[model samples]
Target: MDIRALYDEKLTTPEEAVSSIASGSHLSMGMFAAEPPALLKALADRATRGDIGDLRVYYFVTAKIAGDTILRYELNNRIKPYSMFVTAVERALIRRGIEDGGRKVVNYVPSNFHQAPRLLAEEIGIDTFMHTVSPMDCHGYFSLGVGNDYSSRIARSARRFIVEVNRYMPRVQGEAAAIHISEVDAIVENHVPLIEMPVRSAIPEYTSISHIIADLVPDGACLQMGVGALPNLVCGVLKDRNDLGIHTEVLNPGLVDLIRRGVVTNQRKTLDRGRSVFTFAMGQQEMYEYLNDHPAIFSRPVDYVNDPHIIAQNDNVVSINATLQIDLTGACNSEHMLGHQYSASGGQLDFVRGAYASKGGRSIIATPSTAAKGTVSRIIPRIDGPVTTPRIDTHYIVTEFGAVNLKGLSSTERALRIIELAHPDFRDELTQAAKKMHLI
Candidate 1:
């Protein structure tokens, strides 16, 4: 049968497309900008009318469309949400649920970016998977577009695979980034613009930290950076670099600018030369436009992109990520705060370990010395909660004050070196605390 005919046969309203979703279904969606707005909204409508209940919904980086619909606190009993990454909206939902004198409505699953797909397949089991995708092309394929992350890995294995074709979604070029229309169980069309992440400007401290990080990154190094003002500023400061490459978890505007400016030629990369690889992307409108049919952009599965062995294949891999707090012994708490999770343990540790394993590689944990208007230092005596990156795996610790290498340092040496990276106001207090712990 002709692919277009098949697509036409499968096309249906969002409500009808999701009508087969039974009670106790384990549903999953794509990450970030690749979420299907209309489909999720229809699902939410079902929940409101008491048509669906006890749904185990799994997703990463919930988009605004779903946040306004299925993720509302009132629907928790009918639609239970579980996520591997907690964004601002999810955080708000959790806080609101707990504030109402009950457990968090959303469940947080602590899994590395690379292992999320496997976790879903073997343990969790995605009964029905749906997400946004580019319209079908001439070859009867739909690009996963900005979200190849974990979705691509589970697209083949899900019990029922559905796609909401969006004309605005970029037709990306990459490995494991497309699914055949014949493979899809259902299709819905809603040509909505992808949600754009607002551009964050860098402060003075961020500027200094970016400069420090840029200086540490030698020319021709393959770079992996998380999304934020600091990482964007660091990419901005690397304009003078020659022939850099990218094998990152998330592609953002800064990295796009580097490619546009010819700063990232990928010519010097030892692996995947002449092409930049990424698991997913989230940025402005221009960034999405840049990704459309771009030959050099290779979208891969998170299992491959964030794998330590895969990242180690590229020489001079440089991983840069942010942290919320760090203890003297180099244990980094990048997520949890005040007995609540501010973020999730993303690919920070994945890249950290990957970069360290690469030949001539360097991993950097960058942060400002202070938070809360300089009232509290980010450096602490002990990370009295979950640690995102363990002390033994930490490589280079960078702040506005200075950068310290903790790979080969002893416990006492690591503590002292970390103290020097703290703010001047907290150095004495940290030292006193370190003394009590016998770290110095």
Candidate 2:
């Protein structure tokens, strides 16, 4: 069919589009803010009525468009939620599913952020891909907007391509960031405002952590920062640096400020030398505006942008990521918290190894000294789960207390060095525990 002819023929309602999904069909949704609200709601509506069975839906950082719609108990048996990263909305519900196996509704996929798209679409053979997009242009093309990460790759790779055309989705520029109307099987118009996530104010401890992280960040270094107050604070402190480069997973508002100030020129990057490369973005309206039609910054697929070997080719790589809990051994838990899978092992491992591979490069894992008002130490003697970034791969570790290098330290010295960065109140206890383990 012709492109325009296909566009007109495929125009359908969200309900009608979702009706085509058969039992045992595997579907992929746009991650973050680009998830199709109307399309997802229709599927959830089917799930609520028990109209569909054994349908698997895969996504990363689901925004919970309909507020517990698909994950409710009535639909638990029919729809299986596979999450790459857990947002607060789905955390408790997904956790409950694991606890009560009979009523299981959710499953967390443990994969690096970089490799998820390929593994989901290629390895698992997920056939259906659906998400919101800008209204089709005169030439029968749709823009994926702020999301080019995996959505772009999946749209072309999936057997069934469904798109929710929205006027409010920003038109962004990047590779595979646009889809031809002829390629899609169904189109649903869902004109809703893009989801806006609020930014947390940078705090004192975050500033303290950022200060040390900023110190290690040299001029012209290609840097990576993930979501958290620490990265934002680090961005705030980075305004004074010169010719900074960005090769990150997500672009926050803090990084935007630096770009505006001429600090991040992308001048020294060994790869994508003149382009600020990112896979996705989450921030205020200003960030979206800055991204649209911008030539300097471009979003690419996660697997391509976050490949560890590719990132290593860039000189002076500095990766800064946060963790919920860390131990004296320098093994960090950036994903799970309170024994629950809070977030996935996103690109943290990718950047950690990638940065360490660069000449004169470093990977930093930073955390607050304690949780629950200094009552518990984040610097524990051991962790309960698999190490997100093992001690051997870890480089620089920072707490509000201070930053410590664990690059070549022995078991004894590494424990002592990490313990030194603990909260003053917990240092004595951590040291005692370290000695008891004969690690120090």
Candidate 3:
């Protein structure tokens, strides 16, 4: 086959690339940094021009392009957006739509990161799939780079697959990261730098909590952590540990720094030994550059990376995640706040169960113990919002006050221990509430 000639024939402008999408088509785009900016912008422009209607778009990790274009309030009718994980950007749009008389700007699709591909392939069929990728290689294969979560799997089965080629995207090497030019229906080039996650400053509470959690992680333990200052602090404290392995849902710059410093040798990992495995990567620009064709970094499908059965292959696995609130009985609410969707379920439960199944594994849930300028308690008697991780799955619960293991404790014991984790100002009230509920 004349691969070069075929590529030239398919290469087109973003406007022309999305022109084939029919009205009311079920479109699935990339997650996080893999989302194509130019293609999405063109599609949004086309939607606003009354070219498309009821275009059900499924995506996660709202990029600036999506927020500025298709996610706008006025475009809600023409382009209905659905997010697997609701970020603050989507929440802002939803709030605006609500204030404008209860109009639904974006629909929420609650999913654990690992099951996204199954949901798309089996339940909600996709008509067209679009995402960003690295420039095609001589073999006519494009790398999915930082967004290998579910996009790679959906691309195989979607009726029409379009790719926006970005020069800056890392040419990641992995089974799930490659898409051949023969499979692509249309191609658009947009040489834009990948979006980066902003670095957060160190906080005293986070530092203290990090110290406590880092102490719990033994040397040579495999880890899965979420993105935030707390996880960064935890990694900072673990730098002195030996042979730390990485098998995480989201890979960040901190983990990359650990590998560069020889702290994470991956020697003791039982699964994917000597290689840092992740479903997706989201971090600063340097992390993206480090991942480009890096032999040690292996990107796999989320189903493999976040699968409890797969994660348990590594002994001494530790999963760390953040939570918004926790009930006295250890029920955790990580996504919702005050009856509104703050984020999606994500892979917190997936890793929690994975760590639980692993030999000598532990799962940690960390919070600040207070919110609203230290007036409101995050550790409560009962969570009013949705319980993201049930009490049965919760293991270690941490706060600035202290960390406690809640795996085998009864309700009375769990309440007594959890109350101690609250801010000093709120402990008395929490105790009173717990007493009223007969939890203590």
Candidate 4:
């Protein structure tokens, strides 16, 4: 096949590209910024016309393009959004309920972030894969752009490959970074502006919690963190520190700041030394632009980055993450809320195990002291849902009041220690229940 001639032959508009999709098709798109805007808009338009049926749009994160247009057609089974990770938009729609309770517009599939591409694409039989990418080069190669997370894994298994070329998509370099033009069946020349996800402003509780966690981090330590207000605030407090390294699941604006400050030199890292490594990138527009052809950062597939064995190779791996609640026994429930699936298990457990396996490493789970305006204590006697991270796997647990390690404690000590970190108003009440459970 003449690759050049085939590339031109395959080029087409977004609407025409999606015409081949059959009703009840399982559609998979790339994560975060790599989700194609033009293709999604065109798909939404198709839905609006009452043509497509039972179109299950499977993705980790929707880029929020043509949202209303697509959602308007949810009255029938024309479009259904199935998410692996619940973003702000997905959460709202899930709570809002689908039209006529129609085929469940927003549903969460419990999954580990690393296993997503294979679990959803191969196991579930995704027939079509469409997403945005950087414009193809002379070699007929296109970069996955901001993320390699689940995209690369699914790109291989997806039956049909389609792409939307956007000039603004950064030319990232790494494993699964570039896709050959021959693999793609259709192309759309759409230059949608990349979305900017600013680091969230920190709440006072997060500010305090971040400082307490930041102090535990030492100079020359390797870090793994997720995106959120507290994690972003923690980065700000560490700006004055030195020689910190980043090897996390997702890179955000905070890591960019650390890099700019010369704090994250990656010189002292034990694994992937001298490189700031990540599975994906998501933040402001500045974060994506800064990664283009940059030699400082390396992006790779989640299977590589989120592997516990791979991450443990880096010593002093301080993994910090947030949770909905932590029980007195040190068990964590980060996914469930109101007896419903609020979010799926991402790389939290992956990093938690990795951080523990690393020599001299520590994994910290941080949450506010209370919820509901100081009325409900986050530190409960026992969680109601399945444990996201079991007590045996738990290490450091932190609240605004303090941080404590749960590695060598018995049930009595565990109860006592967690109570000490709980809000003063709730400690007495928690202790009484601990006694009834034969814990304290």
Better of 1 and 3 by lDDT: 1
How many steric clashes between backbone atoms does each model show? 0, 0, 0, 0
**lDDT tens readout by residue for model 2, 310-330:** 889989989998888888788
Give per-residue CA lDDT, model 4, range 167-196, as digits (tens): 889988878889998888898888867877
Measured on C-alpha atoms, candidate 3 has an lDDT of: 0.87
- What residue runs in model 4 are displaced by over 4 Å at the alpha carbon? 1-6, 66-76, 98-103, 341-344
How much is the lDDT of residue 433 in candidate 2? Answer: 92
lDDT of 2 at 402: 86
Candidates in order have lDDT scores of 0.88, 0.81, 0.87, 0.82
Give the clashing pairs for model 4: none
* Candidate ordering by lDDT (highest first): 1, 3, 4, 2
Candidate 1 residue-wise lDDT, 1-440, digit = tens: 49979999999999999989989979999988988999999999999999999998887777788898888888999999887788788878877887899776888887666888898887889999998999999989999999888899778789999899998999998887888888999999999889998877777799789988988898689999889899999988888787999999999998988998999989988778999999999998889988999999889888889899999989899999999898999988877447655454588788999999999999999899999899999999998766788898999999999899998899899988899999999999999999999988
Q: Compared with the true structure, what per-residue lDDT tens digits does model 3 show for residues 125-156?
A: 89999989999999989999887888889999
Model 1, stretches more than 4 Å misplaced? 340-344
For model 3 the TM-score comes to 0.97
Task: Give the lDDT of residue 162 in candidate 3.
Answer: 96
| Model 2: pairs clashing at backbone N, Cα or C within 3 Å | none
**Candidate 4 local lDDT, residue 415:** 94
> Which structure is stronger by TM-score: 2 or 3?
3
Query: Where is model 2 more than 4 Å wrong at Cα?
Result: 1-4, 98-102, 340-344
Scored against the true structure, residue 374 in model 4 reaches a CA lDDT of 95
